[PDB]
Amino acid sequence: SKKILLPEPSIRSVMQKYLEDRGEVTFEKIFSQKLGYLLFRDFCLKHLEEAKPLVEFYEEIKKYEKLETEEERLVCSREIFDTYIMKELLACSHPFSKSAIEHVQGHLVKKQVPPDLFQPYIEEICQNLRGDVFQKFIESDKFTRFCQWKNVELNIHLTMNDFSVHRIIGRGGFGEVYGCRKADTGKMYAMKCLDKKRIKMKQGETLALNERIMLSLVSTGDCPFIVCMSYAFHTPDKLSFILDLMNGGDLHYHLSQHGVFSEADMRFYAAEIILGLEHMHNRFVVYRDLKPANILLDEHGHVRISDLGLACDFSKKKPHASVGTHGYMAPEVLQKGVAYDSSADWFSLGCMLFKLLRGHSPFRQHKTKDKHEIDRMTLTMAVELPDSFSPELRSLLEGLLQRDVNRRLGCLGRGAQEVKESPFFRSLDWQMVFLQKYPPPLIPPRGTKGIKLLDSDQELYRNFPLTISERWQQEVAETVFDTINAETDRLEARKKTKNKQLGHEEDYALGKDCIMHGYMSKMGNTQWQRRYFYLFPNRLEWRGEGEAPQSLLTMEEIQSVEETQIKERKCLLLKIRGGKQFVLQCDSDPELVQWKKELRDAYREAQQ
């Protein structure tokens, strides 16, 4: 039932080639993936000799980067020097280039402590690990394990069965949002449900789909300033966005509940919002709907940006459209034909910030539905501002709300950083907000239609299911990764004992110029018998567990390998030379695609 299960170590041969095909057996691709790294260091620290320091050194370097003030890092660098450079130089066990050493030297004697410092060393730890070291990881038991997880990573479809849904969190336009738990692990995520029916009604299919695309373009890398996507899946009628769990409402609500905000309080909000934008702009994405009600709060009082639906990718094609809520739009958006980038966000920002101090949108001097009056106030006027603000806040707002593209903050120069520097933000260390180490101003208190659905609409929702690799990994690693590794280490050492004194099956695949060996099911009228197959470049054998392979299906009698769908599963159809037909069922999607290819290659070359 509930708990997560690991597929056995024999999965190996199949996985290894699956990966290999996609060229994902590089040092790099594997160090980057959070479990890839974690398993690599576990192999280095326990089993290999010359690996030990290289890793402990790396891990210590990461901690240094992560430190905050000038004086914690000052100390940390010293120890590193002594321990991993100096003392290692005494017994010349230091394998690093001349130029490298001398960078760190010339710094530590001058007390200068940037977090980048240990970089040129970083790169050479990679270096030494990339070559030989990595190859022994390849053959290692820890690689075997890596496969095990990655398998399961790739085999992960979702239904509501995979969620224990708790409470309602407030509606969207196309349906509601809940809070829940993934019973896999037991993280707390939120669930945005869009009902397809509704999306067909409002012609928001363009939105619904775009919301998807954006969400995936953003969530890579870790952010705390964006509602972040961790999965995407659908049941016949419901869309599902597994999202970051965000509780105490939107800024809009709290603006109405608290009232206008003190200068210092806006600052905090501003900061975070800014950081958020930056992240988006770095993936070449423009939000466009920067507005009070799109900013959510967690229990602890910080914030994130939310509805990406109305956002865009400008990587190749810059937009000319008019998308946003009418109070907060830059001149560029509003105009018919003019192309813009991030710029429109920066304006939108100002407007929203303004609102947090004053109660209204900057151009909204009370016209309810008359959009054109908010639009012309934008174009002829950059609005005059009272004496209650500091001369410092005054120049931050006046520089943001320039009706020119060129003259405004966040445009012609460094972009996101231009804003970070204007004298309003003089009293902040910018990494401090990035850690969310500041205190928040507001800790939030203790909280239809009968139309049917085509097939033509349903095919707009394949190529939507998504599992953003990285996210999943994280989740695992905070909670179960560790005690599921040692539990299976227990199940695999018990599997080796039940076979020895009963005479182990002198493995007969590790002796021949074989090609692959994985688990499958086959048919004879309607049962499914589960068997273990062995693929040589001219035959395909099989044994039951206790015997030596009695049966074979040879390559030259195979006429066409195809895929079918037997009760909504994917399966393999093997046409034979008497007219005969034979069927294969796999467990894990990759497994399937690898048989599919390797059979199709072996029979093409066995018939040559």
Swiss-Prot record:
<dbReference type="GO" id="GO:0004703">
    <property type="term" value="F:G protein-coupled receptor kinase activity"/>
</dbReference>
<keyword id="KW-1003">Cell membrane</keyword>
<dbReference type="InterPro" id="IPR000239">
    <property type="entry name" value="GPCR_kinase"/>
</dbReference>
<dbReference type="GO" id="GO:0045988">
    <property type="term" value="P:negative regulation of striated muscle contraction"/>
</dbReference>
<dbReference type="GO" id="GO:0060048">
    <property type="term" value="P:cardiac muscle contraction"/>
</dbReference>
<dbReference type="Pfam" id="PF00169">
    <property type="entry name" value="PH"/>
</dbReference>
<dbReference type="InterPro" id="IPR000719">
    <property type="entry name" value="Prot_kinase_dom"/>
</dbReference>
<dbReference type="InterPro" id="IPR001849">
    <property type="entry name" value="PH_domain"/>
</dbReference>
<dbReference type="InterPro" id="IPR011993">
    <property type="entry name" value="PH-like_dom_sf"/>
</dbReference>
<feature type="domain" description="Protein kinase">
    <location>
        <begin position="163"/>
        <end position="425"/>
    </location>
</feature>
<dbReference type="GO" id="GO:0071880">
    <property type="term" value="P:adenylate cyclase-activating adrenergic receptor signaling pathway"/>
</dbReference>
<feature type="region of interest" description="C-terminal">
    <location>
        <begin position="426"/>
        <end position="608"/>
    </location>
</feature>
<dbReference type="Pfam" id="PF00615">
    <property type="entry name" value="RGS"/>
</dbReference>
<comment type="subunit">
    <text>Interacts with the heterodimer formed by GNB1 and GNG2. Interacts with GIT1. Interacts with, and phosphorylates chemokine-stimulated CCR5. Interacts with ARRB1. Interacts with LPAR1 and LPAR2. Interacts with RALA in response to LPAR1 activation. ADRBK1 and RALA mutually inhibit each other's binding to LPAR1. Interacts with ADRB2.</text>
</comment>
<keyword id="KW-0966">Cell projection</keyword>
<feature type="domain" description="AGC-kinase C-terminal">
    <location>
        <begin position="426"/>
        <end position="476"/>
    </location>
</feature>
<dbReference type="GO" id="GO:0007217">
    <property type="term" value="P:tachykinin receptor signaling pathway"/>
</dbReference>
<dbReference type="GO" id="GO:0042995">
    <property type="term" value="C:cell projection"/>
</dbReference>
<feature type="active site" description="Proton acceptor">
    <location>
        <position position="289"/>
    </location>
</feature>
<dbReference type="GO" id="GO:0045880">
    <property type="term" value="P:positive regulation of smoothened signaling pathway"/>
</dbReference>
<dbReference type="GO" id="GO:0005737">
    <property type="term" value="C:cytoplasm"/>
</dbReference>
<dbReference type="GO" id="GO:0019079">
    <property type="term" value="P:viral genome replication"/>
</dbReference>
<feature type="domain" description="RGS">
    <location>
        <begin position="26"/>
        <end position="147"/>
    </location>
</feature>
<dbReference type="GO" id="GO:0031755">
    <property type="term" value="F:Edg-2 lysophosphatidic acid receptor binding"/>
</dbReference>
<feature type="binding site">
    <location>
        <position position="192"/>
    </location>
    <ligand>
        <name>ATP</name>
    </ligand>
</feature>
<keyword id="KW-0597">Phosphoprotein</keyword>
<dbReference type="GO" id="GO:0006468">
    <property type="term" value="P:protein phosphorylation"/>
</dbReference>
<dbReference type="GO" id="GO:0098793">
    <property type="term" value="C:presynapse"/>
</dbReference>
<dbReference type="GO" id="GO:0005829">
    <property type="term" value="C:cytosol"/>
</dbReference>
<dbReference type="GO" id="GO:0002029">
    <property type="term" value="P:desensitization of G protein-coupled receptor signaling pathway"/>
</dbReference>
<dbReference type="GO" id="GO:0006886">
    <property type="term" value="P:intracellular protein transport"/>
</dbReference>
<dbReference type="InterPro" id="IPR044926">
    <property type="entry name" value="RGS_subdomain_2"/>
</dbReference>
<feature type="domain" description="PH">
    <location>
        <begin position="513"/>
        <end position="604"/>
    </location>
</feature>
<comment type="similarity">
    <text>Belongs to the protein kinase superfamily. AGC Ser/Thr protein kinase family. GPRK subfamily.</text>
</comment>
<dbReference type="GO" id="GO:0003108">
    <property type="term" value="P:negative regulation of the force of heart contraction by chemical signal"/>
</dbReference>
<dbReference type="GO" id="GO:0016020">
    <property type="term" value="C:membrane"/>
</dbReference>
<keyword id="KW-0418">Kinase</keyword>
<dbReference type="GO" id="GO:0001664">
    <property type="term" value="F:G protein-coupled receptor binding"/>
</dbReference>
<dbReference type="GO" id="GO:0007186">
    <property type="term" value="P:G protein-coupled receptor signaling pathway"/>
</dbReference>
<dbReference type="GO" id="GO:0002026">
    <property type="term" value="P:regulation of the force of heart contraction"/>
</dbReference>
<dbReference type="GO" id="GO:0005886">
    <property type="term" value="C:plasma membrane"/>
</dbReference>
<keyword id="KW-0963">Cytoplasm</keyword>
